[PDB]
């Protein structure tokens, strides 16, 4: 990058951007000492570009990094943690301070997947479900311990875990299993003490807490997740951190447009867990459960057509379904269908399963492509093609578009870096970064913007 930084920002998008691009002998070792200077929080959002970098790449950048993440490991045991996993997931083809640190999350991680691999041998769900209880119910024992779940935003104490509340989510081998987990609040997690056990709609939370030793603690607070043992979550990890990103940049540019990011925890190449949305379900069991158009269904459970519970519920739904129709259009999401898309008790959509995106195209599908695509049902929720909010709809859509090119290359960055020595689908040559460039139109005037989201609009619906 040309040296000549020296025209000052500066930004850690941009720090980022000088280590990864940059050939000058003096400057990677430079943003490596400038790491330092950054919200830490800000800095452990780009982690995995890091490692990728740290481990594909040159000496160079791997010296330069080297010295940050040893500070903050010492720093942070949580960070640790991540760094290891990071470090085992991203490379192929290519009493704290302890060596005990991490074993008993390590042994607990490796217990959850244990059991997730074990259910292989139940053909249904159902008995998966009970023999996963039944598996589940053991760690208790274990518990309390020095164990935490990184998906919370919040540094903790695994104290119990509701084993009679999991459940299994489908049929198949490496069919994944949802688990409820009750935990107490730290100030630091490092600083804080171990405590001790106590052996005798989501309202599961209250159900639960009602239900549970450890529930009069107004530390006390119930998470949940997602444990997939045979499933590569780094794609969707990717996908992660596009979508929290673009929620960045729309809030930045004050665009209303909603999408949810949820979290993604690598813990291998073939396992990971996922932090699951609440209180949204599934789209298609809406259809199936209500037996009713959508739209009647939002007639049915949020008010009628002037009732201000409708009135929000489908402005919501329409601001999220135009972020996701530029989520899906920019980073090229595929395998779009109605398990895919969820719907909250709010009226937004809430897509999910971004394991084909960009480059990445499903198998089979003959001359059928599996993408977004705005039904007639969704209109009808919406307006119809002249309706109120339908132009407000092609109206974000544009207005999000715009701010996305003005902050391209924050976006790019994210990507570009994690091709690096990637066995994954989603990337193809330098054909990926090619086109998602040219999916940004950074030659289009607004006029010309307006035109191709109604193109896209049109392109949508056939
Ligand atoms: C198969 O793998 C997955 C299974 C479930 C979800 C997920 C999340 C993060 N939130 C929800 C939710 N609220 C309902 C349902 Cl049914 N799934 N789900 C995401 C997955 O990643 C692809």
């Excluded at 990677?28 to 995995?48: H, S």
């Excluded at 997939?228 to 447009?257: H, M, N, T, Y």
């Excluded at 008790?345 to 809430?350: D, K, P, V, Y």
């Excluded at 995106?357 to 993408?371: D, Y």
Aim: aromatic residues 10%.
């Amino acid at each position: 990058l040309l040296r000549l930084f020296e025209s000052k920002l500066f930004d850690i998008s941009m720090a980022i951007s000088y280590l990864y691009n940059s050939k000058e002998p003096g400057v990677q070792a430079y943003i490596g000492n400038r790491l330092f200077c950054f919200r830490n929080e800000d800095v452990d959002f780009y982690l995995p570009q890091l490692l990728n970098m740290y481990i594909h790449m040159d000496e160079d950048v791997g010296d330069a990094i080297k010295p940050y993440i040893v500070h903050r490991c010492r720093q942070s045991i949580n960070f640790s943690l991540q760094c290891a996993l990071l470090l085992g997931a991203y490379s192929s083809d290519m009493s704290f301070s302890s060596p005990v640190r991490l074993a008993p999350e390590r042994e607990f991680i490796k217990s959850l997947m244990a059991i997730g691999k074990r259910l292989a041998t139940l053909p249904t769900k159902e008995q998966k479900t009970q023999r996963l209880i039944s598996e589940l119910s053991l760690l208790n024992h274990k518990l309390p311990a020095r164990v935490w779940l990184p998906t919370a935003g919040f540094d903790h104490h695994v104290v119990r875990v509701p084993h009679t509340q999991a459940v299994v989510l489908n049929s198949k081998d490496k069919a994944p299993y949802l688990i409820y987990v009750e935990v107490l609040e730290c100030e630091n997690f490092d600083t804080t003490s171990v405590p001790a056990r106590i052996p005798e709609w989501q309202e599961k939370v209250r159900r639960i807490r009602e239900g549970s030793p450890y529930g009069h603690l107004p530390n006390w607070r119930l998470l949940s997740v997602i444990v997939k043992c045979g499933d590569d979550l780094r794609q969707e990890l990717l996908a992660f951190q596009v979508l929290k990103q673009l929620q960045s940049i729309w809030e930045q540019e004050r665009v209303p447009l909603w999408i949810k990011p949820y979290k993604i925890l690598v813990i291998s190449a073939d396992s990971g867990m996922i932090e699951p949305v609440v209180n949204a379900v599934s789209i298609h069991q809406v259809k199936k459960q209500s037996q009713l158009s959508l739209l009647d269904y939002f007639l049915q459970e949020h008010g009628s057509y002037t009732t201000e519970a409708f009135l929000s519920a489908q402005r919501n739904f329409v601001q999220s379904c135009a972020g996701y129709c530029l989520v899906c259009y920019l980073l090229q999401v595929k395998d779009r269908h109605n398990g895919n898309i969820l719907l909250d008790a709010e009226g937004h959509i809430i897509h999910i399963d971004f394991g084909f995106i960009l480059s990445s195209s499903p198998r089979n599908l003959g001359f059928e492509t599996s993408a977004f695509k705005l039904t007639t049902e969704f209109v009808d929720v919406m307006g119809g093609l002249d309706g109120d909010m339908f132009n407000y709809y092609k109206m974000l859509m544009l207005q999000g578009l715009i701010a996305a090119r003005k902050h391209m290359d924050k976006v790019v960055q994210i990507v570009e870096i994690m091709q690096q020595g990637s066995q994954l689908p989603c990337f193809h040559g330098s054909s990926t970064i090619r086109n998602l460039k040219e999916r940004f139109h950074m030659s289009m005037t607004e006029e010309q913007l307006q035109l191709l989201v109604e193109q896209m609009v049109d392109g949508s619906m056939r």
